[PDB]
RNA sequence: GCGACCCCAGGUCAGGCGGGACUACCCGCUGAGUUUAAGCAUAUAAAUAAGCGGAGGAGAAGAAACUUACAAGGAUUCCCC
RNA sequence: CCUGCGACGGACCGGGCCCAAGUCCCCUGGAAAGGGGCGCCUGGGAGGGUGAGAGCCCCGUCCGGCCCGGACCCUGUCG
RNA sequence: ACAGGCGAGAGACCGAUAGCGAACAAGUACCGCGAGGGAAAGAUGAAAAGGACUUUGAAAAGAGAGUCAAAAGUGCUUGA
RNA sequence: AGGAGGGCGCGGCGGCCGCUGCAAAACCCGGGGCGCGAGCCCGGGCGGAGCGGCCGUCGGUGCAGAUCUUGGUGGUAGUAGCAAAUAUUCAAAUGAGAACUUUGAAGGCCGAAGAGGAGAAAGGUUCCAUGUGAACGGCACUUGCACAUGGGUAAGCCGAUCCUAAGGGACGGGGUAACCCCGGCAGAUAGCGCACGCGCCCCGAAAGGGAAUCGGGUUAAGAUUUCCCGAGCC
RNA sequence: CGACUCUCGGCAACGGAUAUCUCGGCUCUCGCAUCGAUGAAGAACGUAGCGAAAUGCGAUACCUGGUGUGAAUUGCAGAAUCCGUGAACCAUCGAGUCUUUGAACGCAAGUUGCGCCCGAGGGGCCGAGGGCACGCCUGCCUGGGCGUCACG
């Protein structure tokens, strides 16, 4: 409820909220198999709240780990692209040429000209 | 005559786009004309219908009748107006659905985005 | 074969119908080629759009002995006699052809 | 015999369900799938049946990972920041 | 048979759930063309070859 | 015995690379017969179908151990002839 | 004889917002979007929707304007 | 170059035995041990306003009645 | 047989001229006509939204046949037929309805290498309860192996699982364009006990081999050793 | 007069042609270049208050999050929300989750079968969670052989 408030709460408070909503979804599943008419719609509301809390906890964990690792990065934290994009040469490697080619660009580059 | 290469004149494509439209697009498609007094006051011609708008029916068998929008059934392309009803064979009451292109809005429900929308549409219709 | 016709020679004994080339994209090819010419022209704004300078050569063989046309590039001997270094020539819009000779 | 009487046997199984494709085409004694050729690393597929090919390719199932590449390609696989807060 | 592999029992459970009548309220939806299940199977006909 | 090297062995050693999928186009191999010849064996079907592999947004080719016989031309590719 | 850094635009690609004019009178019809009368827009009379052949009921279309975001090459003036 | 993929535009093309096999929960139902084979099936009405109630009947239904411009009465436009 | 000319009809495209909710197309009619004819024109009805004629041009353009395709429908015809496995009867109940359901009584059959009681394959909910619109159960049904809604399968000891059989796969190596085909061809064999010592892969049997359970009770439906009671074992 | 058969018309049947349509097909043209051991395509099983399928998703399961828009979704019912950090079977995407499998990777496989190692957290025990395939490259560690030597 109110993910903005969830982002304020600390990790101990967030896991305490997670425990409460799990106990409360269980009490509803007991109600669902016995009898009720308006406790059934609480299932959707509370199941989504459990997802909401776990999303916030997870997003905080990854942001913390991304800060703590900015040497080698863990495999799940690495930039995920297509497999072919990851195998590409860097711009430094793509733009590297040897001396005999760097000289000709220094001495004889293409000029800007016009015909009268 | 249309000039845009990116706009399709295909009747099959236009009917598919109209009928397979998401909810947020049906809101623009389900727009209503403003009344003469409201058009003069706001300098806008047409607005998307909303719940709790006051409306007058100007076409059909309920032409002339007034009420407030109690339902916007976007899935059926109809709005329901207060006390515009019919009796069934069993005597019960059912709201009659009217297309919003056959009504005029007489009173507008304005929260904060209705005013902002009215400002945007006025400027083009004012210049 | 029944009358006084030519002897027929139709080269249609293979699967020629899997190798039919139509030309319904001909007006689209013309527009794509035109668009690239305008893009290339803007990429080199003052440089001439017709490419580098070409020499004059005689078309080979006795049928075309007497006709002149554009060659590939200027000989290394022609550039030297005009004072243009062979490394400078391509950069200022002149084509170089080290294969050709002046007889 | 040879007919109704011989059709009565029908007690053993040549094929069971396949681990890889789920058809009842896994020859138990051969230990090979007759549809996909499961133990082989590559999938069994032949150009003399374009109907058999079209019945199982990319699109006949659900692409859990693909179907998102065109959307990630449009954004240049940005994979970086998030939209600025409202 | 009584002797079942787990994978066979799991598939048999799914086929048991799938042969039910369609809910009545499905026929009341706005643009509905569904009439019956079109995929009901009776055990005595139409065997599932497992 | 201490050492230098060579060849090789074992590692859940540190960091990395490969295998599969897709078929319209493209690169490599392998390879029929129906058919036509009014029979049929060379020939044709066809350096095609099928079969086994390899890529990309294009691929392959490409800067003369090339043509010609001309007053000679001048990488590759594609179109017309 | 010849030989790096930045600032501000352009051009390319995408996204969004706004952008003309009757629902006037009569008749028939369940319904006018039909017929008759009087009018208006048009760089918009492509198309579609709406209770019957709708330029002016609605979405759009035309001519434009405004804003947001990429691409890190290519190029136009400055230091 | 491009009968694949993602995204656009168009047509002197077909109009539900046609056009792709598939306009629809179609490579589906179903068939074969298997490799494989492979359909049929679109259209109430502007709006469900989808026929209350009386009576007969075990029921299904009928006869009255009601809605609709129309019974067009849920495989329902027309209906050889 | 065959050729040719001039016409009739179908569907588009470019043009021209029109019709239609005061009722278009299609369809129907012992309606009226025109044309030798292909055909056309009008009338009445149904139907409820589109259609026509002329010039030019174009085409998936005209059916009685093909043991033609798909779909529908006749006569045959209320006909052929429903005849193996000895067999039913009475009273009552229930029900709208009973030759066929239930109870009781009687008469018979299977005759224990059964028409009895339980399993392996195979099936997959058919098992049990309650209920019943139609369909189905080739007569019928109140009834069900049908249909609808629910319920139901409990293990340290029963099995699988463990071992190997015929056999199958397979590291290295060998062959092979590759797919793939070869396991004795020996390759530092990838490890085991207490530094020291030794050193001749997996899969394949619910009938083969094999750790350990008995009696009594219990449900609508389980337990022929799983639950309960008691008593043991590995 | 009647029955039967045949025939003509009217009405009713049977059947689904014709006509008018069409969120489909077919053909042509254009633009773009993006699958996978960071686990793809494909396969299985689950997942909703009422769902079987199709569609969607993955024990965070017809969805979580961000941004945009701005008051719905609806077959029934209940909840939430409205001059708002705010409805939606809405759009879009940068943050997340993502069961069993499958090239599929501890060994297998008509088996949810048979192993080994580490390990939060509460000597030993119980752990949540996770590793252990093959080929190859660079570097590294531990080694083997009088193969080539040098000095002892
Ligand atoms: K001739
Ligand atoms: K072409
Ligand atoms: K219109
Ligand atoms: K078909
Ligand atoms: K009708
Ligand atoms: K014509
Ligand atoms: K056990
Ligand atoms: K055994
Ligand atoms: K008659
Ligand atoms: K038709
Ligand atoms: K085993
Ligand atoms: Mg040929
Ligand atoms: Mg035989
Ligand atoms: Mg066998
Ligand atoms: Mg085997
Ligand atoms: Mg059977
Ligand atoms: Mg390592
Ligand atoms: Mg590959
Ligand atoms: Mg011959
Ligand atoms: Mg012959
Ligand atoms: Mg012969
Ligand atoms: Mg081939
Ligand atoms: Mg690629
Ligand atoms: Mg190349
Ligand atoms: Mg050279
Ligand atoms: Mg040449
Ligand atoms: Mg406007
Ligand atoms: Mg007028
Ligand atoms: Mg009408
Ligand atoms: Mg393409
Ligand atoms: Mg069809
Ligand atoms: Mg037709
Ligand atoms: Mg089958
Ligand atoms: Mg059979
Ligand atoms: Mg109509
Ligand atoms: Mg009808
Ligand atoms: Mg008649
Ligand atoms: Mg005509
Ligand atoms: Mg045609
Ligand atoms: Mg024909
Ligand atoms: Mg015929
Ligand atoms: Mg004939
Ligand atoms: Mg016949
Ligand atoms: Mg037939
Ligand atoms: Mg007959
Ligand atoms: Mg008889
Ligand atoms: Mg008989
Ligand atoms: Mg009897
Ligand atoms: Mg006897
Ligand atoms: Mg006896
Ligand atoms: Mg029994
Ligand atoms: Mg029973
Ligand atoms: Mg019967
Ligand atoms: Mg049943
Ligand atoms: Mg045992
Ligand atoms: Mg063993
Ligand atoms: Mg053996
Ligand atoms: Mg090998
Ligand atoms: Mg074993
Ligand atoms: Mg045994
Ligand atoms: Mg029992
Ligand atoms: Mg969905
Ligand atoms: Mg595996
Ligand atoms: Zn398989």
Q: What is the DSSP string of A29-90?
A: HHHHHH--SSSSHHHHHHHHHHHHHHHHHHHHHHHHHHHHT--PPPGGGS----HHHHTSPP
Instruction: Judge contact between B73 and B18, C-beta under 8 A.
Output: no
Nucleotides in chain J with any atom closer than 7 Å to protein CB: 22-24, 28-31, 34-46, 48-53, 56-58, 60-80, 82-86, 88-98, 101-104, 109-112
Residues in chain D: 86
Measure E50 CA to nearest chain D CA, in Å: 6
Q: CA–CA separation, A116 vs B73, rounded Å?
A: 71
Kind of pairing, strands B103-107 and B31-34? parallel
A108 and C CB contact within 8 Å: yes
**B56 DSSP β-pair partners:** B66, B104
C51 and A CB contact within 8 Å: no
The beta-strand segments (E) located in chain C are: 56-58, 68-70
Element (H, E) at B70: strand B66-73
Nearest residue to B100 via CA among B45, B36, B56 = B56
Q: Which phi-psi region, left, alpha or beta, contains residue A3 (left: φ > 0; alpha: ψ -120 to 50)?
A: alpha
Q: What phi and psi, each to the nearest 5 degrees, are found at residue B69?
A: -70, 115
Kind of pairing, strands B103-107 and B54-57? antiparallel
Subunits touching C (CB < 8 Å, at least 3 pairs)?
A: A
Sign of CA dihedral D20, D22, D23, D25: positive
Q: What is residue A110's DSSP assignment? A: P
Q: CA–CA separation, A53 vs A3, rounded Å?
A: 8
Those residues with Cβ within 8 angstroms of residue A91's Cβ, 6 or more apart along the chain or in another chain = none
Q: Which two tokens stand for residue C36?
A: 């690239």
CB contact under 8 A, A113 and C93: yes
According to the entry, how was the structure determined?
cryo-EM
E7 and D CB contact within 8 Å: yes
Cα angle A14, A16, A17 (rounded to 5 degrees) comes to 65
Q: CA–CA separation, D44 vs D55, rounded Å?
A: 13
Cα angle D26, D29, D34 (rounded to 5 degrees) comes to 30
List C residues 71-90 in contact with A (Cβ-Cβ < 8 A).
Answer: 87-88, 90
Residues in chain E: 50
Task: Give the Å distance between the CA of B54 and the centre of ligand 51.
Answer: 75
Count the neighbouring beta carbons within 10 Å of the beta carbon of residue B32.
Answer: 23
Q: Which phi-psi region, left, alpha or beta, contains residue D2 (left: φ > 0; alpha: ψ -120 to 50)?
A: left
Q: Tell me the HSE value of A88 on the side-chain side, using a 13 A CA sphere.
A: 11
**C50 DSSP β-pair partners:** none
Interface of D with A (CB under 8 A): 69, 77, 79
Nearest residue to A64 via CA among A6, A10, A4 = A10
Q: What phi and psi, each to the nearest 5 degrees, are found at residue D5?
A: -65, -40
Whose tokens are 């019945």? That residue is D55
Largest CA distance in chain B: 56
Query: In a 10 Å sphere around its CB, with 0-12 CB exposed, 13-18 middle and 19+ buried, how is residue A18 labelled?
Result: middle
Q: CA–CA separation, C49 vs C38, rounded Å?
A: 9
Q: Which two tokens stand for residue A15?
A: 């896991």
Q: Tell me the HSE value of D35 on the side-chain side, using a 13 A CA sphere.
A: 16
Q: CA–CA separation, B77 vs B25, rounded Å?
A: 12
Whose tokens are 């075309």? That residue is C64
Q: CA–CA separation, B116 vs B110, rounded Å?
A: 9
D and C in touch (3+ CB pairs within 8 angstroms): no
| Interface test with chain C among A100, A112, A116, by most C beta carbons within 10 Å | A112
Write out chain A residues lying below 8 Å of C92, CB-based.
111, 113
Strand ranges of the sheet holding B31-34, from the earlier edge strand across to the other edge: B46-48, B31-34, B103-107, B54-57, B66-73, B78-87, B93-98
Instruction: Judge contact between B52 and B100, C-beta under 8 A.
Output: no
Strand ranges of the sheet holding D24-27, from the earlier edge strand across to the other edge: D15-17, D24-27, D32-33
Kind of pairing, strands B54-57 and C68-70? unpaired
Whose tokens are 């305490």? That residue is A16
Write out chain E residues lying below 8 Å of D24, CB-based.
49-50
Cα angle B2, B5, B11 (rounded to 5 degrees) comes to 60
Measure D65 CA to J58 C1' (Å): 13
Q: What phi and psi, each to the nearest 5 degrees, are found at residue B118?
A: -65, -35
Instruction: Judge contact between D27 and D34, C-beta under 8 A.
Output: yes
Helical segments of chain C, H only: 26-43, 76-82
**Annotated binding residue D18:** yes
């Amino acid at each position: 409820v109110k993910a903005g408030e969830l982002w304020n709460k600390s990790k101990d408070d967030l896991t305490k909220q997670l425990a409460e909503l799990k106990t409360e979804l269980g009490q509803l599943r007991i109600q669902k198999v016995a009898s009720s008419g308006s406790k059934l719609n609480r299932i959707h509301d509370i199941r989504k709240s459990i997802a909401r809390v776990l999303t916030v906890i997870n997003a905080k964990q990854r942001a913390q780990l991304r800060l703590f690792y900015k040497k080698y990065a863990p495999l799940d934290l690495r930039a995920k692209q297509t497999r072919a994009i990851r195998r590409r040469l860097s711009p430094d490697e793509k733009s590297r040429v040897l001396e005999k080619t760097k000289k000709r660009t220094v001495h004889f580059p293409q000029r800007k000209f016009a015909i009268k | 005559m249309k000039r845009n290469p990116r706009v399709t004149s295909s009747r099959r494509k236009c009917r598919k786009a109209h009928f397979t439209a998401p909810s947020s697009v049906r809101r623009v498609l389900m727009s209503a004309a403003l009344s003469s007094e409201l058009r003069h006051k706001y300098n806008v011609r047409s607005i998307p219908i909303r719940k709790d708008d006051e409306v007058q029916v100007v076409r059909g068998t309920y032409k002339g009748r007034e009420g407030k929008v109690v339902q916007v059934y976007r899935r059926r392309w109809v709005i329901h107006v207060e006390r515009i009803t019919r009796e069934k064979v069993n005597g019960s009451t059912v709201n009659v659905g009217i297309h919003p292109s056959k009504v005029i809005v007489t009173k507008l429900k304005l929260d904060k985005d209705r005013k902002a929308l009215l400002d945007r549409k006025a400027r083009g219709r004012a210049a | 074969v029944k009358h006084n016709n030519v002897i027929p020679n139709g080269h249609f004994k293979k699967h020629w119908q899997n190798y039919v080339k139509t030309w319904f994209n001909q007006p689209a090819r013309k527009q794509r080629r035109r668009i690239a010419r305008q893009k290339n022209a803007v990429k080199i704004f003052p440089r001439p759009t017709s490419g580098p300078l070409r020499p004059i050569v005689q078309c080979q063989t006795r049928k075309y002995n007497m006709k002149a046309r554009a060659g590939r590039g200027f000989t290394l001997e022609e550039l030297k006699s005009a004072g243009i270094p062979k490394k400078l020539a391509p950069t200022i819009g002149i084509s170089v052809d080290h294969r050709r000779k002046n007889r | 015999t040879k007919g109704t009487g011989s059709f009565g046997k029908r007690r053993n199984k040549t094929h069971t369900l396949c681990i890889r494709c789920g058809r009842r085409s896994f020859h138990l004694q051969k230990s090979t799938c007759s549809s996909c050729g499961y133990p082989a690393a590559r999938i069994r597929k032949y150009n003399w049946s374009v109907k058999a090919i079209r019945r199982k390719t990319t699109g006949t199932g659900r692409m859990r990972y693909m179907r998102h590449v065109p959307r990630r390609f449009k954004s240049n696989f940005r994979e970086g920041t998030e939209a600025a807060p409202r | 048979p009584s002797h079942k592999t787990f994978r066979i029992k799991q598939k048999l459970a799914k086929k048991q759930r799938q042969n039910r009548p369609i809910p009545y309220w499905i026929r009341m939806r706005t643009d509905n063309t569904i009439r019956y299940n079109a995929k009901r199977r009776h055990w005595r006909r139409t065997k599932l070859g497992f």
